[PDB]
Amino acid sequence: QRIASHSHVKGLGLDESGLAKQAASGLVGQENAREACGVIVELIKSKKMAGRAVLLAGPPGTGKTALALAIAQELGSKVPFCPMVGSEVYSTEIKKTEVLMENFRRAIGLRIKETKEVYEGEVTELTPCEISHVIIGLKTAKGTKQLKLDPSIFESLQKERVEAGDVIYIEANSGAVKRQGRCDTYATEFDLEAEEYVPLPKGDVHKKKEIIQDVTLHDLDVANARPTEITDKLRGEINKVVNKYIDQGIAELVPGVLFVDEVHMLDIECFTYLHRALESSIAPIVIFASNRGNCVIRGTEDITSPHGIPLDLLDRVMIIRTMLYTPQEMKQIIKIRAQTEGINISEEALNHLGEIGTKTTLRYSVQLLTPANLLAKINGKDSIEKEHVEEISELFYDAKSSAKI
Amino acid sequence: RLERIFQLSEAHGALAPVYGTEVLDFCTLP
Amino acid sequence: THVINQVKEDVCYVSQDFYRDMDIAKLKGEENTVMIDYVLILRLANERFAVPEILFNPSDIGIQEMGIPEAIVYSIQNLPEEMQPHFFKNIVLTGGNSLFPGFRDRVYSEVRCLTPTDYDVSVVLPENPITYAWEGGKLISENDDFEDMVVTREDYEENGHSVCEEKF
Secondary structure, three states: OOHHHHOOOOOOEEOOOOEEEEOOOOOOOOOOHHHHHHHHHHHHHOOOOOOOOEEEOOOOOOOOOHHOOOOOOHHHOOOEEEEHEEEEEEEEOHHHHHHHHHHHHHEEEEEEEOOOOOOOOOOOEEEOOOOOEEEEEEEEEEEEEEEOHHHHHHHHHHHOOOOOOOOOOOOOOOEEEEEEOOOOOOOOOOOOOOOOOOOOOOOOOOOOOOEEEEHHHHHHHHHHHOOOOOOHHHHHHHHHHHHHHHHOOOOOOOOEEEEEEEEOOOOOHHHHHEEEEEOOOOEEEEEEOOOOOOOEOOOOOOEEEEHOOOHHHHHEEEEOOOOOOHHHHHHHHHHHHHHHHHHOOOOOHHHHHHHHHHOHHHHHHHHHHHHHHHHHHHHOOOOOHHHHHOOOOOOOOOHHHHHHH | OOOOHHHHHHHHHHHHHHHHHHHHHHHHHO | OOOOHHHHHHOOOOOOOOOOHHHHOOOOOOOOOOOOOOOOOOOOOOOOOOOHHHOHHHHHOOOOOOOOOOOHHOOOOHHHHHHHHHHOEEEEEOOOOHOOHHHHHHHHHHHHHOOOOOOOOOOOOOOOOOOOOOOHHHHHOOOOOOOOOOOOOOOOOOOOOOOOOOOO
């Protein structure tokens, strides 16, 4: 199944009353932050509040990325979730303001389920006998039909090779995709026609297909700008046509959710565009993440501010606290990886690995869980014993023992 | 038994230009 | 010329597809779907569906056609232009070559591709028609219509040979 680094996330475990369970979907800890993120996912699912900002204040090494992934998995596939690395902003050819604004347009999306009839082409109905009137038959495996087409489609027909045995896909907006060499063309058992040899296209003539599709506005802007957007003519036209599409009853808007990591490592001009553009009435909700604490804002060289965030940006932002843990549940979290791994472990090796986890950090034990099972597979043991983990604790060193040597 | 089949064929051949005018309305009004 | 007729009537049948059953017929070193015995026996190969393939495509000889599926569609264009659903919607399979299994579905699938979907077609293969004109002759002779139009002697001598044309 190709399990990634963390695959514990399958939910967030919120009940109807609004309580937080002790162990739900491998997310043990922080019931206050559990309720604080339940409030904001209810705010996302309520579809009434846009223009908010969430900061996850905590020490480095708590696992707030798993909390954001739990938010994204509770939302699922309906709400578009696009995380942004802080190093995705520093571009060379495109300015950073436009990158942040295009991320804000990646947030906002719509869904306008529709229809589309397929035509699929007969074999040979090249009848230009009028040019306004073209008769094209169809010979599919279900049977034969005919249709009259206005001259165009035919002007797309003579552009491509229309010979004995071709496919003609005709869309609703005169979008013709054509092939060559179908059905049968083996006349005298001769050489290559150098075409595509496809069997019979089983299926009838007239289907009525319905697809629910989520469309982002940035793909719309890319498809409309080409045959840095103007904020007086282009995006206002997009806003007007989306207003017309939702007033006629075609598309349905969904709110935008973003998640930004290493926010404090951005430039101060990105900050003064960020807390100016989140003041708009159309601004999506963006969950910010600050990694380290009190440092210097990039571009100031003297201004001291907490969490690397200026005073104008630190205001009007909700703050959720994520503190450290207690060691007596660390052996539980390793167990959450064990049922993810598929190989059961013993009881004393869990104790030694929990001792190594409470020695320096939990992530060191989580990363050493994999070579323990690897040496258990090499040596032939069905479970992980204490000798393999006590050998891999001495063979592989962390940053503290590397700074000690 | 053919007359109901001819009525259904005329029904399809009457509803198909209705969908054609619907395509023209969704392509020429917005 | 008599045991081979029994092999044709007992072993040979009409397959579904010709190219697909040619693709499957290779690497037949262990699959018990092709080889079968009779009475020399003298083990046979995959020609049990290539023989009824001649009726569907005569291209191996080069006499006339390359099937049967297309001539019925290319031939029946008559006054029944208002009479064409009178024509095609009643197909009667009879004779001696319709004894092979797998014939009805393949003939229906080959005539379905060249005739419209909305036409309520019906391809019916009964179980009786080994002697089917005999059944028609014994049905008409018992439905008291033979004595109404009688064409015999008393009329062959009074009218020389002009007696079996206007009546039948």
